[PDB]
Amino acid sequence: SEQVWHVLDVEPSSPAALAGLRPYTDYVVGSDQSEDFFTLIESHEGKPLKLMVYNSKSDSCREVTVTPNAAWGGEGSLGCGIGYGYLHRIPT
Amino acid sequence: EQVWHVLDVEPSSPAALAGLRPYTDYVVGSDFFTLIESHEGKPLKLMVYNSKSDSCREVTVTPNAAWGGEGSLGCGIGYGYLHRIPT
C-alpha cells in the first residue's frame, strides 16, 4: 500500500507532458486523498486527477494535475511509461 | 514574433528538469517574464528551437520561485540572441 510509480518516458503533448511530469526524475507517491495508480487513472478517464509527485533531483514533493485522455492521439491515457518502484536508467 | 535565448542553465533547476539546453535553445512560443510569474508552481508549455538540430520541440517547464536560487527558472535569458564566446 506504500507503492511508488517511477515516471519513465513522457511523450511530447501527452496528458502527462501537459501536467509537467518529468521523465525518470518524478515518482508518483499518491493521489491527494484508498486505490492503486492504474484504477485511479482508469476511473478518472476524462477528469482531472490530483497527484503527489516526488522529484529525485530537486529532492522534493509537489502537486500535479492530470487529465487522462485515451483520445489524446498516442498510446494509453497518460502517454507515459511507468515503472514499479524504480528502474535504473543510465544517461548515455 | 519574439524570441528568447536560453543562456546558462543551473544544475537541478526547473529549467534543467525541463531539459532546457544552454546557449542553443530558444523559446519561440506559448511578456515571457509575465507568463513565467503567472505560472509559478504550474506547468507551462513552451515551443523551443534548438540551433544544433535546426528543429523545434515542445518543452513543459514548472517554474518554482522556491527552487532555492535566483528567479523561478534558474536559467539566464537574453532577448533574441546574446553573442557569447566561450574562451
Side-chain angles (χ1 to χ4, degrees), chain A residues 13 17-20 22 55 57, chain B residues 12 14 17 43 45 58 60 62:
Chain A
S13 295
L18 319 195
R22 304 151 161 170
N55 184 278
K57 257 66 148 159
Chain B
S12 301
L17 293 167
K45 201 201 307 176
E58 178 201 282
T60 288
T62 297

Side-chain angles (χ1 to χ4, degrees), chain B:
Chain B
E1 286 77 17
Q2 76 207 33
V3 167
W4 302 91
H5 183 198
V6 182
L7 304 171
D8 44 308
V9 170
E10 283 308 279
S12 301
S13 69
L17 293 167
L20 292 176
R21 304 166 190 160
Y23 308 115
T24 71
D25 276 340
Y26 302 77
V27 178
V28 287
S30 206
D31 57 340
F32 183 62
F33 303 125
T34 284
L35 209 61
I36 285 148
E37 289 177 52
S38 65
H39 289 76
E40 169 59 25
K42 174 179 224 139
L44 175 58
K45 201 201 307 176
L46 305 173
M47 197 48 147
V48 184
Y49 181 92
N50 184 278
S51 62
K52 306 178 167 301
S53 85
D54 182 34
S55 323
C56 278
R57 79 186 186 282
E58 178 201 282
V59 184
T60 288
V61 63
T62 297
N64 173 6
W67 79 283
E70 187 167 23
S72 73
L73 288 189
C75 66
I77 283 284
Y79 201 80
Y81 175 80
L82 297 193
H83 194 52
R84 174 182 168 272
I85 301 138
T87 109

Side-chain angles (χ1 to χ4, degrees), chain A residues 71-91:
Chain A
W72 78 270
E75 276 191 1
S77 285
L78 292 193
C80 61
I82 295 291
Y84 197 70
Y86 173 85
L87 306 180
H88 194 58
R89 172 190 190 267
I90 305 149

Side-chain angles (χ1 to χ4, degrees), chain A residues 6-7 10 13 15 25 29 36-37 42 53 55 57 62 65-67 71-72 78-79 81 84 87:
Chain A
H6 189 196
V7 172
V10 172
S13 295
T25 64
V29 306
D36 75 333
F37 188 56
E42 182 166 74
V53 177
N55 184 278
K57 257 66 148 159
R62 81 192 188 283
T65 302
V66 65
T67 308
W72 78 270
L78 292 193
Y84 197 70
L87 306 180

